Design an enzyme around this catalytic site. Structure first.
Site, short mmCIF file in Angstrom:
data_model
loop_
_atom_site.label_atom_id
_atom_site.label_comp_id
_atom_site.label_asym_id
_atom_site.label_seq_id
_atom_site.Cartn_x
_atom_site.Cartn_y
_atom_site.Cartn_z
N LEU A 85 40.52 43.60 35.90
CA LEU A 85 39.64 43.82 37.30
C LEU A 85 40.30 43.56 38.48
O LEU A 85 39.96 44.17 39.60
CB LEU A 85 38.59 42.65 37.10
N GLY A 86 41.66 42.86 38.39
CA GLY A 86 42.41 42.36 39.62
C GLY A 86 43.36 41.52 39.29
O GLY A 86 43.64 40.99 38.09
N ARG A 87 44.41 41.40 40.10
CA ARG A 87 45.45 40.71 40.41
C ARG A 87 45.50 39.93 41.51
O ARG A 87 45.55 40.30 42.63
CB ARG A 87 46.85 41.57 39.86
N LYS B 14 47.83 36.31 43.44
CA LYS B 14 48.94 35.53 43.52
C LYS B 14 49.07 34.61 42.27
O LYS B 14 50.29 34.30 41.87
CB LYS B 14 49.10 34.66 44.97
N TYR B 15 48.03 34.35 41.50
CA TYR B 15 48.19 32.97 40.76
C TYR B 15 47.74 33.39 39.46
O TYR B 15 47.70 32.82 38.25
CB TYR B 15 47.51 31.84 41.13
N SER B 16 47.18 34.79 39.42
CA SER B 16 46.67 34.85 37.93
C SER B 16 46.26 36.54 38.01
O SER B 16 46.35 37.11 38.96
CB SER B 16 45.15 34.52 37.63
N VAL C 213 43.02 39.01 36.32
CA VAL C 213 41.63 38.88 35.93
C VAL C 213 41.27 40.01 35.20
O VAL C 213 41.40 41.37 35.59
CB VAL C 213 40.67 38.62 37.28
N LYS D 104 40.78 35.16 33.00
CA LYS D 104 41.56 35.01 34.07
C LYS D 104 42.92 34.35 33.43
O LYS D 104 43.03 33.18 33.05
CB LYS D 104 41.21 34.02 35.13
N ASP E 284 39.57 27.49 49.74
CA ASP E 284 39.57 28.99 49.64
C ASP E 284 38.33 29.80 49.70
O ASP E 284 38.12 30.82 49.11
CB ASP E 284 40.42 29.36 48.42
N1 LIG Z 1 37.89 38.54 40.51
C1 LIG Z 1 37.16 38.53 39.43
C2 LIG Z 1 36.00 37.94 38.67
C3 LIG Z 1 35.85 36.62 38.24
C4 LIG Z 1 36.57 35.42 38.27
C5 LIG Z 1 36.14 34.23 37.96
C6 LIG Z 1 36.56 33.06 38.48
C7 LIG Z 1 37.96 33.15 38.96
O1 LIG Z 1 38.61 32.04 39.15
C8 LIG Z 1 38.42 34.35 39.50
N2 LIG Z 1 39.51 34.43 40.46
O2 LIG Z 1 40.28 33.37 40.26
O3 LIG Z 1 39.82 35.57 40.94
C9 LIG Z 1 37.63 35.64 39.26
C10 LIG Z 1 35.00 38.81 38.13
O4 LIG Z 1 34.19 38.76 37.37
N3 LIG Z 1 35.23 40.20 39.03
C11 LIG Z 1 34.60 41.30 38.74
N4 LIG Z 1 34.59 42.69 39.18
N5 LIG Z 1 33.62 43.56 38.71
C12 LIG Z 1 32.84 42.89 37.78
BR1 LIG Z 1 31.45 43.74 37.10
S1 LIG Z 1 33.22 41.27 37.53
#
Ligand SMILES: N#C/C(=C\c1ccc(O)c([N+](=O)[O-])c1)C(=O)Nc1nnc(Br)s1
EC number: 2.7.11.1
Length: 328
Positions: free
Chosen positions: A43-45, A47-49, A51, A66, A154
């Site tokens: 779903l994404g990146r 600095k620290y994780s 996802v 994550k 944050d």
């Molecule tokens: N980013 C993200 C998501 C959850 C998340 C939960 C705790 C947390 O600490 C972090 N984090 O640190 O970036 C992220 C997520 O669920 N993104 C989604 N995008 N589309 C759908 Br559908 S879900």
């Protein structure tokens, strides 16, 4: 030296909680079964994780995983302990599990899945009512973590998940969150630039929950005025100048004077002299449907230089801005 500061609320929460509550370094991670979760898509990146969307194959429920990037045991256990401490609180993302990722050699936090509406789409479409509603929902989460002795540090749109279909909101990414201990000096290198409170921008380390209320005000300003981000500094110095062009330099000096703070001398030829502005000047035909006297007064009471003068989350929830929001 600098004048000390304490939070005006929840000052002693971590004093009267047991040591195990805030002593995250001593926390013992109870590990789940890493094979319970099959990653579906990244779903994404950060600095620290990184996802990932995942399926918990034991219950056939979507989850979010994550996988932390390498950093120190304390910061990992800080986030873990805070998530466990806050679990079940209003609009706090639910930590469902913690597994050892065998590839990264790092913890993977498993969270409830929020079917989050596209953030661009949400900012472009949120109505006046929706903004107030979701601001109230965020305030529930912030008052909760603050009442639990934790500042998020944050607060920003990307850390607010909204499933707009179900009007469901989750405050996420507690990786910067800290326990508030009166008198403790904290890292000022927290929050994203546009949401950093003046306390961070002037290097005042003895900050508290009220940091989150500044960030929240920055979000509110960006929403009701349709200017993303509202204070759009090029760097942390210009960030403070951008703020001073709105809140004025005289109250900035009052602020740093109250705490015996000195500005970086590099401000001497970039800060200038600025009157405090009235919030109405940011109103225009493209955002006026999102602006009300209540909105402006509420925003005015969040965006104070003096962290001690900002509304607390609880006071914010009392504000007439939310009178129109249906209470459950
Ligand atoms: N980013 C993200 C998501 C959850 C998340 C939960 C705790 C947390 O600490 C972090 N984090 O640190 O970036 C992220 C997520 O669920 N993104 C989604 N995008 N589309 C759908 Br559908 S879900």
């Amino acid at each position: 030296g600098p004048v000390p500061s304490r939070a005006r609320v929840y000052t002693d929460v971590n004093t009267h909680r047991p040591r195990e509550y805030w002593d995250y370094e001593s926390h013992v991670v109870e590990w789940g079964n890493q094979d319970d979760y099959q990653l579906v898509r990244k779903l994404g990146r950060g600095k620290y994780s990184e996802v990932f969307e995942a399926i918990n194959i034991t219950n056939n429920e979507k989850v979010v995983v994550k996988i932390l990037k390498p950093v120190k045991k304390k910061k990992i256990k800080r986030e873990i302990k805070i998530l466990e401490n806050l679990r079940g609180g209003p609009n706090i993302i639910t930590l469902a599990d913690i597994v050892k990722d065998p590839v990264s050699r790092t913890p993977a936090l498993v969270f409830e899945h929020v079917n989050n509406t596209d953030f661009k789409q949400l900012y472009q479409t949120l109505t006046d009512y929706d903004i107030r509603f979701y601001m109230y929902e965020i305030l529930k989460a912030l008052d909760y973590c603050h009442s639990m002795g934790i500042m998020h540090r944050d607060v920003k749109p990307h850390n607010v998940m909204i499933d707009h279909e179900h009007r469901k909101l989750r405050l996420i990414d507690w990786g910067l969150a800290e326990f508030y201990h009166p008198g403790q000096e904290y890292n000022v290198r927290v929050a994203s630039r546009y949401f950093k409170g003046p306390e961070l921008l002037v290097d005042y380390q003895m900050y508290d929950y009220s940091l989150d209320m500044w960030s929240l005000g920055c979000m509110l300003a960006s929403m009701i005025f349709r200017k993303e981000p509202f204070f759009h500094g090029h760097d942390n110095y210009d960030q403070l100048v951008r703020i001073a062009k709105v809140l004025g330099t005289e109250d900035l000096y009052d602020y740093i004077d109250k705490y015996n703070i000195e500005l970086d001398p590099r401000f001497n030829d970039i800060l200038g002299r600025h009157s405090r502005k009235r919030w109405e000047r940011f109103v225009h035909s493209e955002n006026q449907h999102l602006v009300s006297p209540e909105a402006l007064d509420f925003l005015d009471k969040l965006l104070r230089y003096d962290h001690q003068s900002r509304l607390t989350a609880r006071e914010a929830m009392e504000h007439p801005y939310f009178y129109t929001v249906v209470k459950d």
